[model samples]
Target: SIVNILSVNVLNNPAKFSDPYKFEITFECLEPLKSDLEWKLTYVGSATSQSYDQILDTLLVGPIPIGINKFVFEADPPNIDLLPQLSDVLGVTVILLSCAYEDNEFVRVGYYVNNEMEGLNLQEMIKKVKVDISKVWRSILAEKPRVTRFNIQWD
Candidate 1:
């Protein structure tokens, strides 16, 4: 995502099996953001401060030379078996969706500087950035979603 966007959201057919296995991520960003877009479904949890889980991992959009700003990426649905994996162990109670731009060299140095100051390695940090959110996503499964979770209509 290049900052300027009308909206960024994902749509699912339904949490039912045999349904269309896809996550429709629609957004308007840098016309170049479509290039080299990458995305993945992941689970993250947190029970210390609050319980939540980020189901849709930051889809790292691989490059797309579409020469346009508005773009729609239909990502594959998350693995079913993995859902339970997050719920059973992580006390996950909710789901979150996230996205990011990978080739952000303009900000790469900033990330490196900030990370190094934290006593974390930029190249070989012991923990990966994805896992923290994995922890965040898992916490979402901690309780009933209806009372705690919010759903948005893609349309």
Candidate 2:
């Protein structure tokens, strides 16, 4: 049996930070899948020039059957107290997600700023981040996912 397949790709706008740079990558599934799907992400970047390096590799895995599933990539606050060599800016954070069924594959990638912290509420921050993240996803998808259509506030 052949099932309809789709591909979605998203990328966040590179944000300029005040002191240190922060960002995230995310994705969401539109239609629900019957079989189990696998999501994978690999991290690459360089600390010297803030470019993606080939040194380290970070991977995330999860089962996304329906609704929205988000993936975030961020860098810790800059450490000025450290040595010059150690004060290199964080490298590029790449976000990748995928699912395979039959012979088709679905994937999406996004980037976000991680500046909301301390003064910001955790829940609120999440919502704010998701808003931008979802936008990126929508722009990449052929048929956009359905919006929640409900006006609800969360604290």
Candidate 3:
């Protein structure tokens, strides 16, 4: 692959659940290319099933350069209604950021996320008709990222 992801900086940690997630993605281009790079952000709502995975957003990055390039990816939080049980909604989950060239996904990065709320227990929150976004705190483990690269045609 000619493009290498140098680093990803999670901008907003411990934000409200409803708040938008921001990622400053920095990457290096070994050589000039013509194709646009497609970037996608996915929210893993459940570990057991892909049914709960949500595609937060997809962006097209273009105008290839032979050096470092950076962009900030912003996406809305996962939909609670689309999530599984309350147990799954209030615990650790996953967020995946992937990049593709010409429909081929060459790199993927994933992070562990922790969601919690203050002054209220899970059971207490469950009793309510709606989950309180104001009380929820979202945190991401950015220190460690699971990065995977695949063999793809660069030319």
Candidate 4:
């Protein structure tokens, strides 16, 4: 019976390892429920001989009146691992959202976006880094990678 327990992730795991390379997470719960929601994030490191999962952060939602299932505050994970190289290091990004209660969870969804490593051109990133004005722009265009979307269901 927690709102913050819910989460949403968007993944662009070029390495296909880090489930959610970087993504937007949300916290929410079903209507008529009254409980505190909690969520935490971890920086999942790549598969090295000895890999480590870095604990990033966690958050607590609210105890607001059970309204219709809805949206809550959403946020993007902080910069974890990355490179300036325009190549594959399993570069990827992801997004996910969901809600949870006692022994049951629902409304889980996921999506994968673009990878900053795959199909990236070094020359382009260097050139664009200084020129492109829009803050929300990609350094370089990625190759057309297969995309997929999914939703979690329960019986």
Candidate 5:
């Protein structure tokens, strides 16, 4: 079966730091394909930079069962991280995606900056990030099946 590309868009954008941005991407398959798919999320400007890559076969399940599949990649790097550096120079974070095997791929991606005040209190910021991302994903999959591979791509 031929892989079909679905959609890609931004999900969230925090208004504070404006450096290390956070975003998510979703992929869907129209027909059940093999489970050897792989996903790579990289910063476009610097090709030599380290990128976040994961094998969907390890992350996903089954022999590429036919249906809708979604993958969410969320990142909130510190101000001193690579993301901040990329954003400072590039204005907007450039994210690229590549998939293995022939299947339908749809992505709904988004980004957000960390704007909360800095202090000894880190719980609020953590909570805020979780809530914001959860809200975005929830809204995106309101009519879709329950998400099985929800992940945050930050250290």
Candidate 6:
């Protein structure tokens, strides 16, 4: 692997549903990369299908140098309006952070997210037609992220 992720820091955990997701990515490169790396953040709305996956944001990191590099990757929360069903909005879900070099995905990091509605009964809240963003709490399982790497053309 040409690039190695040193550490990932999830900022502002236990936030509101409307809050943006912030991740500080620290990586080290063995060699300088001429092309920029494309990073994307995705939210899995449902486990049943890929159609529910939402691309929250895509960012580009410039010509990487041979050394440690860091950046803050921030994105808005998944749009609840697009969910196939309202029930999918609550409970545990997944958020994916992937980096691509020349369109070839090299690394993917997944974090489990718990969306909870505090100060109210979960059963009663789910029955309602509206999902109150103010009442909903979002937290990232930062202790462990499902990290995956693939062999890719790094030129």
RMSD of each: 16.6, 15.2, 3.5, 9.5, 12.1, 3.3
In candidate 6, what are the lDDT values of residues 91-136, reduced to their tens digit? Answer: 8889899999999999999989888776656765525446666778
What is the C-alpha lDDT profile of model 4 across 1-155, one tens digit per residue? 33333333343423233332344444444455545444444333333324444444444555546543333333333343442221222334333333343334433443333433233458645233432112222211123323322243322
List lDDT for all candidates, in order: 0.33, 0.32, 0.84, 0.36, 0.35, 0.85
TM-score quality measure for candidate 1: 0.35
TM-score for each predicted model, relative to the true structure = 0.35, 0.26, 0.86, 0.37, 0.38, 0.88
Top TM-score prediction, candidate number: 6
Candidate 4: where are CA atoms >4 Å away?
1-34, 72-115, 118-155
- Worst-scoring 10-residue span by lDDT in model 5: 133-142
Error of 3 at 128 (Å): 6.5
For residue 15, model 5's alpha carbon misses the true position, in angstroms, by 5.8
**What C-alpha lDDT does candidate 6 achieve relative to the native structure?**
0.85
Candidate 1 wrongly placed segments (more than 4 Å): 8-10, 17-21, 31-35, 45-92, 103-155
| lDDT at position 17, candidate 4 | 32
Residue 4, candidate 5: Cα error in Å is 1.7
Ordered from best to worst TM-score, the candidate numbers read 6, 3, 5, 4, 1, 2
Candidate 1 vs candidate 4: which has greater TM-score? 4
Query: Residue 44 CA error for candidate 4 (Å)?
Result: 1.5
Model 1 Cα lDDT, one tens digit per residue, 33-141: 4344444343333343443443444455544443334445444434445544433333322233333344332111000000011233477644444323222221112
Which ranges of candidate 5 are over 4 A from the true structure?
14-31, 46-63, 75-93, 102-155
Whichever of 3 and 6 has more lDDT, that candidate is 6
Candidate 5 per-residue C-alpha lDDT over 42-89 given as tens digits, one digit per residue, 9 for 90 to 100: 333334255432221212323555666555544343223443333232
